[PDB]
Design an enzyme around this catalytic site. Sequence first.
Site, PDB file in Angstrom:
ATOM      1  N   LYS B 193      31.519  57.993 -27.683  1.00 43.45           N
ATOM      2  CA  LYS B 193      30.964  57.391 -28.944  1.00 43.45           C
ATOM      3  C   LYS B 193      29.513  57.099 -28.614  1.00 43.45           C
ATOM      4  CE  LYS B 193      30.539  54.923 -32.864  1.00 43.45           C
ATOM      5  NZ  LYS B 193      29.411  54.116 -33.050  1.00 43.45           N
ATOM      6  N   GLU B 269      29.348  45.246 -22.082  1.00 39.37           N
ATOM      7  CA  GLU B 269      27.964  44.502 -21.435  1.00 39.37           C
ATOM      8  C   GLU B 269      27.071  43.916 -22.622  1.00 39.37           C
ATOM      9  OE1 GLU B 269      23.952  46.095 -19.507  1.00 39.37           O
ATOM     10  OE2 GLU B 269      25.342  47.650 -19.902  1.00 39.37           O
ATOM     11  N   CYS B 303      16.984  46.409 -20.639  1.00 36.97           N
ATOM     12  CA  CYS B 303      18.319  45.842 -20.957  1.00 36.97           C
ATOM     13  C   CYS B 303      18.228  44.484 -20.404  1.00 36.97           C
ATOM     14  CB  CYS B 303      19.224  46.916 -20.478  1.00 36.97           C
ATOM     15  SG  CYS B 303      19.526  47.027 -18.430  1.00 36.97           S
ATOM     16  N   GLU B 400      17.555  36.425 -27.746  1.00 39.74           N
ATOM     17  CA  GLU B 400      17.494  37.520 -27.172  1.00 39.74           C
ATOM     18  C   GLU B 400      16.244  38.287 -28.122  1.00 39.74           C
ATOM     19  OE1 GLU B 400      17.672  40.870 -27.880  1.00 39.74           O
ATOM     20  OE2 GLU B 400      17.459  42.057 -26.000  1.00 39.74           O
TER      21      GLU B 400
END
Lengths: 498, 498, 498, 498
Positions: B193, B269, B303, B400
């Site tokens: 996906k 994650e 990331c 973030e």
Amino acid sequence: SIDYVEMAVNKRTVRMPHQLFIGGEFVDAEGAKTSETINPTDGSVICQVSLAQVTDVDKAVAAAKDAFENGRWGKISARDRGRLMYRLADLMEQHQEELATIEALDAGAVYTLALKTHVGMSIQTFRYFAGWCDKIQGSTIPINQARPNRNLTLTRKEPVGVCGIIIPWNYPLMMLSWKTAACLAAGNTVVIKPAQVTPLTALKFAELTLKAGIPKGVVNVLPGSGSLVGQRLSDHPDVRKIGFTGSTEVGKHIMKSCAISNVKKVSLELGGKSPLIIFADCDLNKAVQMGMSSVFFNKGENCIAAGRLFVEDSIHDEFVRRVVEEVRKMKVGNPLDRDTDHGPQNHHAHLVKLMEYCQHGVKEGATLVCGGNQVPRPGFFFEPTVFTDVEDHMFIAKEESFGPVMIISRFADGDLDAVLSRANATEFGLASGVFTRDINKALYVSDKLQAGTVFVNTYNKTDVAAPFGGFKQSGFGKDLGEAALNEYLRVKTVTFEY
Amino acid sequence: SIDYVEMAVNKRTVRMPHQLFIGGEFVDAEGAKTSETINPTDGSVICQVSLAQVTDVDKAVAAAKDAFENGRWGKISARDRGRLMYRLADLMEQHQEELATIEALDAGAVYTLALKTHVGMSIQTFRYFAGWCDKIQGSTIPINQARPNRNLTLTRKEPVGVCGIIIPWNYPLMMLSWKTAACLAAGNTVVIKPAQVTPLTALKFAELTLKAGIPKGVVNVLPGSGSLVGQRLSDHPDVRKIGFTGSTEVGKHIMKSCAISNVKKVSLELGGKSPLIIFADCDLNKAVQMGMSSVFFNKGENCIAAGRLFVEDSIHDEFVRRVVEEVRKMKVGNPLDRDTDHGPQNHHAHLVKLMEYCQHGVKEGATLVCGGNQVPRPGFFFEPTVFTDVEDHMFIAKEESFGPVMIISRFADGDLDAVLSRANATEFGLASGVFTRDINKALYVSDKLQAGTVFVNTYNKTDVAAPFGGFKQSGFGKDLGEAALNEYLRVKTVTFEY
Amino acid sequence: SIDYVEMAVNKRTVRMPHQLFIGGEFVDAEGAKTSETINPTDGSVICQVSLAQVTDVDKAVAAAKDAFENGRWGKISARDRGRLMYRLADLMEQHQEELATIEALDAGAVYTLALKTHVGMSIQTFRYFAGWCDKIQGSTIPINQARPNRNLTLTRKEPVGVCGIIIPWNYPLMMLSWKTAACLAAGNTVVIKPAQVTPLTALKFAELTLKAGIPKGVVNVLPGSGSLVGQRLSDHPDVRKIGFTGSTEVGKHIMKSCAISNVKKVSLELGGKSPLIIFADCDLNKAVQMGMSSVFFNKGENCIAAGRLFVEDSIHDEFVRRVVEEVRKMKVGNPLDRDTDHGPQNHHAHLVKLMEYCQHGVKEGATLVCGGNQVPRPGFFFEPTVFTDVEDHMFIAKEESFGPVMIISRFADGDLDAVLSRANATEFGLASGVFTRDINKALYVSDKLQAGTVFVNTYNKTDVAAPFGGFKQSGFGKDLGEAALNEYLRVKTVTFEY
Amino acid sequence: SIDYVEMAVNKRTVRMPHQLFIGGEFVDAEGAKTSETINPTDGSVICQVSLAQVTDVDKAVAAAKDAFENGRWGKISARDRGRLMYRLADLMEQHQEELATIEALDAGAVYTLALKTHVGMSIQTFRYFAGWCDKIQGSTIPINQARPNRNLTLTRKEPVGVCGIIIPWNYPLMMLSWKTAACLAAGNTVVIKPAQVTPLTALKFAELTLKAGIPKGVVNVLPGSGSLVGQRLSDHPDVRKIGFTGSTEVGKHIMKSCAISNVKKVSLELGGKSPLIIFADCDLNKAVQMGMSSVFFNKGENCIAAGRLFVEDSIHDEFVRRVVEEVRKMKVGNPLDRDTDHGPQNHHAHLVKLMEYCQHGVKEGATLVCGGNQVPRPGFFFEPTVFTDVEDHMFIAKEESFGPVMIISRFADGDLDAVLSRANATEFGLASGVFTRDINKALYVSDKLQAGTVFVNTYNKTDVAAPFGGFKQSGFGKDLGEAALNEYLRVKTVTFEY
Ligand SMILES: Cc1cc2c(C(C)C)c(O)c(O)c(C=O)c2c(O)c1-c1c(C)cc2c(C(C)C)c(O)c(O)c(C=O)c2c1O
């Protein structure tokens, strides 16, 4: 100065602790609340036990955060921790008649195993799992040695936090130690939500640590309601880990806290449907006896016990009619009575909960080859039942009985994969079994069974360094083994450079 | 005979696959449904890509159960599996200009790293993790040697089932391979996906396996909607494992399927808040440059990148004013343009999503030491912003950003644990960092940070055998390492006797 | 009914065993032969000890083949073996005053370390290496799964045979346990050729196993002549393994038996020339003290101790003149006397053997910055000597002193590879060292030194799980670590098929 | 510009290299010395090959110390080393007709295996053992974390030095690669002392590396005399490692250099006496055929082949008389001739060396059930001999034949440990075997045999990841496995502190 209604029973002064041992002391619940315990041999009550509230879950996971942080257990060197944990085994086995008779008394467990298992089997896992305190290792790998520099690494194994302790109902005390070793050792401290039906073996353990002087707030047990104390420990932010064994139910609802409250790891176990695929080629004398010991052990209250006892045609009635004799051989008596070979179930309604299972299958068309209803005496003694030939679609050949109800099936002479696909098809994927002697018939018994301990030619081997867990439909996270200190300890990384 | 609107762009015929490669072939979604892709450099569109439905999740996890079960991949010996997986690396790196420019084109990634990382960094993890195919081991212990009998054991490592593949949005292609190695190797097959905003690097990979002739139905990719295709793979019964990296959001809602649908393991994650605690004692020339490379790498779409760049007082304006110069040094241009040092963000609204973050903190009282708003050109180029001295309570020093927004703070000269408790207090616990030379100042930098890769004196080390994961608030389950084949492989037990 | 001339010395009844414990009992040598022991503090004698012959080597490796084959140790399950080995540590540390004072008395070792190391340091390696009894593993790989058949494997770790035990002379008792753990655990039994100068700590150990009831003939110690008992164990056919630490001499002659007699593996260690490359950047207060502890430890009788103590110019006389003060600080007294900081050497001629070394270099042109000759008292106390600036061609800067003789050299301020190529050039390749704080100066200290434990910023770390060995010119085969049970256990293969 | 007397034989231009490839080039020996090669099919000679001297051993271990130190191989990153080693397999298998026919021509090996094994079986071990170049790991443990400091470690795996290469005589080329993989990979370079009787397959390999452009001086082969070139490499100081397979003789004399010259590790293999204990219960059709393939493979020149083919009584003459037919079935012809099933021995006198073995036992009273003397044709074809019932005391049932001489024995019907103690008693402890189907008869076949690969139900499995070695009387040090890069790589230690 803990209070006990001293019980000079079984030639010994049973002191089973009532309180909620927190902050270094045993204390009562909210407002001196309580929660009783039942004598399963008779339906009698034993004594009074306080039952904590959501008032307490604010206290345990904050008071047992004392040992973790400041006192002795938080920082003492690797030796004395085990050396203190090891001294526990010094006191405890001396008082097996405490934990034998108590668990003989609390959960009605027979004295014959109350001595060997209900203290003895705990004495092992104290000393085998007190091992790895001062013995656990890093394993720290070749990081990129980055030229023109020079690099390194050293990962490690670190304690996690505070943990959740849901001992199941069936094996109350010994399964305390099986989760009192892999939890404490990893650096953390513990807080126990025992079974409140038989919490008096559980609460009895921590009193010995009192003399045993483990650092304060390292171990704290907590009787309570079904899904409040469990849930209140199931949602608190402070808690870091969680231990439970019981129904398949509670998890899929309790595992929705872990998707939300604090993402902390989870440890849950569910009962199973172990298909014990006995061929006839094995010694028929032991194909029945240990086969008969395969199910009826400790009056049927066996966690993984195989309640689908396949047999080849050639010995079925043989195995049946002989075992039919063996179903008669057993003793029903006081579990502390040495001759007792069968005691009552844990609890009152559960004997109902087993009997309708009998009643369910018998209505389906099941050969009720003996008994099936309550032994006519107080307590909840149940007649060891033996069905026959029950196929899979029925309700008995799918449900977990939770009783010593030998529920046979049958197949073709020598079949390997098909009927064992009636051993393979059950989604309860904890245990298995097999008997055989020509092990051209144990080459295809154990490869294909999607089970968690794919036995061959034995069973019933509760031993400390047999690392154990379950597959899909009975939980995840392994107990009684080395991986037990595989998840309980957090993996750090480092990455230097010069 | 797959169709492609042939794109002779960047001196090469870009064929980015559109279909839903299932059952051995690339095919369209339900009823020839589609889903476009965006050119992030300009806001332009590239081409048409079918977008599957819940019609497909009935097809992938049933058609990719073909490779697992019957064809070549299900049973071929340990050698050719890697030997076939290894031949993939033979074709793929040859066409880096495919995966470089495409990922230079799909996700607007600069060509300079489009060559080194966006194909090169994938070429490694093909060959490092194609290793353990024919190399993985049992580890089978001393079971109770039960006298008067003689016992044994041999546990093992076995594939699980079918898996879930949610590549994140940021690192589209290379993070495909990082989850195309540890998944396929364990015995199973895969179903992907991908990110549908930049799915054209992802879908481009499987075409090479077509020539590369991996067993049919071993790899199948699947663009789709946000939480339907993901959820429809998040609840199906057939699926056994699940891979995803993205927001902190989707999990706590997606992790409620795993409490219910099929209890199968989970792998998620979340982005992070790495505090990059630069002392001044490190070489100030590299305290800024690699510090400046610590955040602004690949135009901020990093990331783990440390968006809280602590600095001692002695060098702050120094590090600032020099870095302030370095904030100017960068190039904003076509990512495939060699001189380009800064490209647009992934997507249109996200540049908004970053700018208000700038706008948030600046309203708080934040020293907007440069820029903070959109680069005035099509696409979504953003001005590399540098705040200053923003303390923790504000919104920028907690959220973030997901941008190249160097968001400094400050502390006392030489502080070890307090301000690093402003590096320790953030619950995003993925990465860390530090600079230092006297490593009496790296003795307390890396011990106490509850982070998942507690760096010292470097950063930015995307390398294959650096085993990686996250701590509490960004997931669980480790990638890019040996434990990657620690969970992906199921542990069996056996227990013989003679 | 073993006889002892009871020695009520040091407030305790020292019973140091005299006999040759064989076949379950302590017994005398050929014809009641003997071999004395020396009191190194005074040159006195302690008592009488039988000294076996080639009459005995026919007896040990045939009588200790009893435990291996038939009795308890040959077959008992994995638990009680460690559980019996573990109970040894229960008795032994209780009697540290036995093994402390005895080794304080036998080899004149100071009591301060006689308590911490000469029993304490043995108490560790009993319990750390009693671990892996019931914990050691197979590791059994993917054999060719040969289609159209189906294959398997399971290698394993198996005991070897009977072993050779040559404890060195310097560290008599504690280095018994360091070779009483990795040998016994692997399945085999042991037969010990101790140092006959100080065999009374060695022979004292096995008496505790007598009460400790280890299986008969599992442990048997054997004093004897230099190269007869050693050679007679060095050539026998029955013996399978061989343990020794001592001179570089004996091996190149003893290793010619292993080319001939029975090809069995070999385990030998040689003394070394560890260059302890102290920069000045380290804390000069500890650059001297632990530097001074780096050589003068346990009155110089240190196995790996660095006898070439490099120093930068900036601190040399500083480090010298301060250490020159520290050379005076030490105590010379009874090793059992608590204040004693320096005792005599092991033996009479060896103090000669060290003094000429002093005399050798001093004739070369060596700055005898203190002492260099015998302390004027009985026993063989030696004055802690400090040379200076001795370059490599001389005889002192190449020979192993085997004394607390700090033998400095010097180099250029900040040199990395050249003078450390005066640390790199010595063929004695056991240990190393370094001090530093800026570890841009420990990036090139430890990479290039072809040594076996390439220390940085410490030393003197005798701890159980520090796996240890030597490089070229001091032996091969690692002690005190996991590889210790890497060679001691033989690797089997299997290869099934169906 | 290497010279070759071009041999257009077997439809291909055989160029078998003659020189001594040193310093980057092929060159002649001392003064243009030579050493011929024999055509074993006819006794003919093939061509001229220089034979080095002690003039050369000064050159190889000094010129191949170039690759180790300075050029490409000494320092290039982990990838291209394998990537260059891997490209070797690209060229080499393309020219199998070179290494097939050559080894079909050099050592007279039949073409049928000259294609499958003599190039194919080499093609594997190039690519399986070219794996671990960029894949090998540290494993770096929990050093004492010394409070109040903080410690670390990282051991590693490092190349050793220069190595010794003594390929045996029997399997000339393929056993080059089996020792051209585990040697080169560990970081070092190689120098080869091949078999000079058939050195033309060996010397043929390195020419491909010439095109293959491996770093100069990484691989250098060296024909020479028996125990001069071997000894001259057996004593040189520069050499660090040593590889050889051959007689039991050379070692016990060569292993006296290693006790003296430079203590460097040793790697030697000796032929064996594998007892292939065939029960009758196995399929008798395959009990003979693969039994017949168990000994007569590649015309008897089999390294481990079982020359003591036990059989139960029930099938002996059956197995005999059928195998007696099978002894007739074989083809004796040109090894490059496809129909050839049996070729000549390696060398002229050896066919003598086998025949007297036949003559020895036959004089003892041995049932010479066929042949036993030379096939009456040039070359040295030998008649496949079949003895019978020869007991152990005789000379044939103890000596290594080194031929396809099926030398049976016999026992009681169903015996397990006694006659297998005639399989257990032989000190040649390399291989074993067994056939069986009821594996209640393979439970005691493989446990007790003190052999190095304790087979069951198969044999003849030369495959790359079967880690292999020998037990006592045939050497020590394992080949063709993971431990192959266990000894070849040296273990470093480090020990930091902060
Ligand atoms: C594990 C073990 C421990 C032993 C111990 C402990 C307490 C140290 C003894 O003390 C001892 O005396 C032993 C001797 O009897 C002894 C022993 O034999 C074994 C053993 C066994 C039982 C079976 C094996 C099998 C079977 C399928 C038959 C193999 O196939 C195989 O390959 C093996 C080899 O690895 C193999 C093997 O090692």
